[PDB]
Design a protein around this ligand. Structure first.
Ligand SMILES: CCc1cc2c(cc1OS(N)(=O)=O)CC[C@@H]1[C@@H]2CC[C@]2(C)[C@@H](O)CC[C@@H]12
Ligand SMILES: [Zn+2]
Length: 257
């Protein structure tokens, strides 16, 4: 029954999911001055040329674009990662206003939205086993700011009216997630968690420094989605972000000087 409202939002999650108050929770504020450049970080490799999207789904908390992960296609490796991680889905978090919506913050700055490209460590065979491991997932996080439109996002925006409500899905093939990436792959990285229940501490976070720009019209369409199912009172899907959590005993590393 978790969600993002007053009675079931982030401050309530710890009752059903005690790990909410754990030692490696996400998101976090990225203090850019305290993050240390790490020249030990191997180069970061995003190989999406063969990515094959299947479907887009309103899951009641966000919308997600799913990929066929049954073959070695669409892999993230290098950077802080050992081994190879396979793309399974992407989704977003966003606000009711352009001044909020991101989960991670940068020197307390909130972006209008945040994209999560979720990948699982192939050493664990599939996603459900990977999330039970401390190094099971790698999530590539990309900030969105409102400005120029992102042409590569438009195909996603245009299908949203077909999945307005919780539980609706639509075929969504041939979508190329390379169109959602900024020019630079400079990043911050730290060990953390899923940002929604069950809040499992299984994620290596890789957060790109360079945001992508999307237009006001594009994010406005995100905000027309509904948290509710069809035939239920309309509740706009907005502010589906968890706030920053305590850093505790963790160091954020930068790939750049
Ligand atoms: C693993 C990253 C992941 C996946 C999902 C969410 C959150 C997630 O963590 S995060 N934000 O990348 O750190 C929130 C909604 C989830 C979704 C995938 C699985 C679902 C559970 C759907 O079945 C229904 C709700 C969906
Ligand atoms: Zn997410």
């Amino acid at each position: 029954h978790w969600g993002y409202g007053k009675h079931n939002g982030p401050e309530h999650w710890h009752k059903d999911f005690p790990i909410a108050k754990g030692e490696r929770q996400s998101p976090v504020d990225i203090d850019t001055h305290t993050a240390k450049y790490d020249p030990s970080l191997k180069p970061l490799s995003v190989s999406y040329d063969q990515a094959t999207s299947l479907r887009i789904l309103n899951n009641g908390h966000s919308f997600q674009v799913e990929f066929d992960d049954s073959q070695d296609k669409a892999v993230l490796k290098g950077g802080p990662l050992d081994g190879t991680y396979r793309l399974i889905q992407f989704h977003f978090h966003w606000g009711s206003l352009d001044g909020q919506g991101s989960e991670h913050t940068v020197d307390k700055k909130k972006y209008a939205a945040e994209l999560h490209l979720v990948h699982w460590n192939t050493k664990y065979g599939d996603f459900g086993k990977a999330v039970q491991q401390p190094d099971g997932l790698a999530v590539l996080g990309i900030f969105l700011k409102v400005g120029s439109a992102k042409p590569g996002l438009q195909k996603v925006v245009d299908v949203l009216d077909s999945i307005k409500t919780k539980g609706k899905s639509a075929d969504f093939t041939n979508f190329d997630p390379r169109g959602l990436l900024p020019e630079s792959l400079d990043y911050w990285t730290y060990p953390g968690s899923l940002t929604t229940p069950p809040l499992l501490e299984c994620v290596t976070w890789i957060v790109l420094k360079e945001p992508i720009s999307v237009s006001s019209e594009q994010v406005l369409k995100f905000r027309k989605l509904n948290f509710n199912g069809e035939g239920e009172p309309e509740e706009l899907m907005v502010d589906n972000w968890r706030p920053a959590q305590p850093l505790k005993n963790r160091q954020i590393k930068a790939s750049f000087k």
